[PDB]
Amino acid sequence: LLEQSGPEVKKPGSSVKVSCKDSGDTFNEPVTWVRQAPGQGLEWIGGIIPAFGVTKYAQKFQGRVIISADASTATAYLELSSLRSEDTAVYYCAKVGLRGIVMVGGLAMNWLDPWGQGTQVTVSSASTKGPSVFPLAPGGTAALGCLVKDYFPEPVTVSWNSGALTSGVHTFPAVLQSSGLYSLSSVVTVPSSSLGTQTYICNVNHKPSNTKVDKKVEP
Amino acid sequence: HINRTALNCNDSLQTGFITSLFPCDVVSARTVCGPVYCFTPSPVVVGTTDKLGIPTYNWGENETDVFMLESLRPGGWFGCTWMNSTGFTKTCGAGGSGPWITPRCLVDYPYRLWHYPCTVNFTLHKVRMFVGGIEHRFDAACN
């Protein structure tokens, strides 16, 4: 499908520039930008027809966004300026279908396909910070895990015994604390007879801060 | 100059005609899909205007945006072509009424194959002549 740029994290008042490149020769055909906040549905932002350069914008972002296209590359661009915490969302890029299309003065509207994988844009004032890893110490089933507290930004990766133990593992989604930092926990459930049978080590990796911590977990 | 392109297309018949997009009087830009080409021997792109000869840059969105084809004339042969909103090649003129110089020749222009898909098998020929006092350099496509 369409290729978009990676995740972005910018402070409030700054500006992001999300790219969207396709491999096919359909670059000149109309493209549409849409974002999706966590609790909301899809929200249209604007669009562009790269063959002529026509840009049509939603009324909300009339003075804050500028959509562009580069014909040398295979990329159309979305540039949102003066960021706020509301602008934290996943930004999507899709093509406007040609068959049955309706174009009024350069605004092409139809069903949307194909799509890009999406671009997470996080707007926060927090600074990059490495996480702290603390043990979660514990017939039936037993439980233990790791607490990955106070880090920024997303994401963090958690392995168990260097990736040898995957069954019965629940790596929970991160939660945004009041301090603007993220906190996460990963747990593993085993039968109680297997609690003292083996050794458990979680492998917390955080690339934005180049932090890698291995923590032994025992009752 | 590119913002003067009337981009009003309505493929309600589900044909997908718009793929290749990516008596001459006054035609309304609200009924034109893509550039408008007139052929004062050599092809000339017509932009959107109002009722006066003043160019407009709204991509043919205004209902008062028109193309002044009769104003774009040399007593030489004249003709214009364009795609209308539903995908029908429209013409006007007297020599043919489009890019048709000869009953079997056609003026080559960057959108010839979209307005005339059946002229792909024609052969290009370099033409140079003085018409009405101006030298015209263009290519003609003939069988």
Added chain:
Amino acid sequence: EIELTQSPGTLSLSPGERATLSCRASQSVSSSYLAWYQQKPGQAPRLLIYGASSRATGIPDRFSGSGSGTDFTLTISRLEPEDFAVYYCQQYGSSPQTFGQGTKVEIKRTVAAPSVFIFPPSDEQLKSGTASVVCLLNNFYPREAKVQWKVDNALQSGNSQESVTEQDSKDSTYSLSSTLTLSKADYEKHKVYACEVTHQGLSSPVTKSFNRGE
């Protein structure tokens, strides 16, 4: 701007049953400019219906849409495991194209009560001025559950956050975590830390607790 309202917010059905999702517009939209989309967690939305009726190329027959004017419906006649996700209705006939809020189709299985565990804060963290107490709810259906923190029998409020997993691929259950965050100062001023869990599959609440310093 045309407002697109979807209902219900969540549909819980077992594989094989019929799912009917509704989309209601404020204006009378044209039946030729309504589309339905399927979206799975992490992935981009995939188109199912366009023109309120026509299926997209590569969409199974069990998907079908209908409706006109203000009320539109998408029907999945025989739910398969890979049909469970969130669905969106889009209109593309008016100048600001709009989408509805998500309707999530979720696998229905037998009610299963959670396995509750509590984890005291590590000494490694207590030396750093913070104390985090974790309560784990493991493998339970449905997702609706309640976690109450009681510090020395005193109910807590405002100093806890939750986190839930997506529905598991194998057993279609959920798991939940609740973290109680205190300062080292306020943590040492109290003895008993309990987690009280209430779920549909629990006849009476299940409480897990520890005693600080023991």
